[PDB]
Amino acid sequence: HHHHHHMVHITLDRNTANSWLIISKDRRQVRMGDTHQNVSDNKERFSNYPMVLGAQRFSSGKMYWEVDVTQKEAWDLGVCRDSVQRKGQFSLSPENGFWTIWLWQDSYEAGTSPQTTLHIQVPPCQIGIFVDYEAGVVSFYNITDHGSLIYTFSECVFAGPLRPFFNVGFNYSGGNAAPLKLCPL
Ligand SMILES: CCCc1cc(=O)oc2cc(OC(C)=O)ccc12
Ligand SMILES: CCCc1cc(=O)oc2cc(OC(C)=O)ccc12
Numbered sequence: 001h002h003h004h005h006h007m008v009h010i011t012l013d014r015n016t017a018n019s020w021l022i023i024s025k026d027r028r029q030v031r032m033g034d035t036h037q038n039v040s041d042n043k044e045r046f047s048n049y050p051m052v053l054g055a056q057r058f059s060s061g062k063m064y065w066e067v068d069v070t071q072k073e074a075w076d077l078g079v080c081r082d083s084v085q086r087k088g089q090f091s092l093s094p095e096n097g098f099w100t101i102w103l104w105q106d107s108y109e110a111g112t113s114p115q116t117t118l119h120i121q122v123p124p125c126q127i128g129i130f131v132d133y134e135a136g137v138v139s140f141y142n143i144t145d146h147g148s149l150i151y152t153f154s155e156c157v158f159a160g161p162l163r164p165f166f167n168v169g170f171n172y173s174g175g176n177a178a179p180l181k182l183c184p185l
Pocket of ligand 1: 049074075088089090091092093167168169170
């Protein structure tokens with residue numbers, strides 16, 4: 001791909017984070033803590049899953065960023081509506097306002113309803129996310145494999161401002177403690 005020139009500097013929004021998450025001082029890295037991180041509750045926080053939003057809101061244009069997923073067993077990445085449900089149980093689907101991919105139990109899937117199997121030959125250590133607001137497109141790229149396409153959502157009905165979306169996943173196994181990291185431009 002040649003989307004690198006739409007690079008945007010994303011930072012994480014602490015106020016949206018699940019109360020177990022630990023966000024770095026530079027707001028570029030997030031990981032699962034082993035306990036509640038001693039923050040007050042608020043209506044923005046994702047309550048049921050280890051999720052957080054980027055601070056940036058996008059309503060037009062073309063945007064690109066990259067995320068490091070090295071040594072994780074489970075995660076989900078993409079964008080979502082600013083208006084997504086924060087409390088209780090929900091599925092990651094375009095009907096619920098999410099355009100995402102995930103790793104779970106040794107398989108990669110796109111967050112459609114029902115979910116779609118992804119075909120990845122080189123397990124990625126870094127993911128590129130491209131959003132074209134006007135075109136209604138969200139695309140995912142395998143940076144480890146020379147930028148190869150992973151998945152494109154087209155005919156997207158955003159229906160609102162978009163925010164970068166992150167899920168570091170649970171760490172029931174003891175093998176998923178590693179952070180998600182926003183990679184430098
Ligand atoms: C068996 C799957 C459990 C699960 C694991 C995980 O890391 O993230 C999730 C995110 C979910 O997103 C929503 C709230 O729609 C739903 C379920 C999960
Ligand atoms: C890490 C995020 C994974 C996830 C998110 C979601 O919204 O729905 C799921 C549904 C799944 O199906 C089963 C077999 O439970 C499995 C995994 C997910």
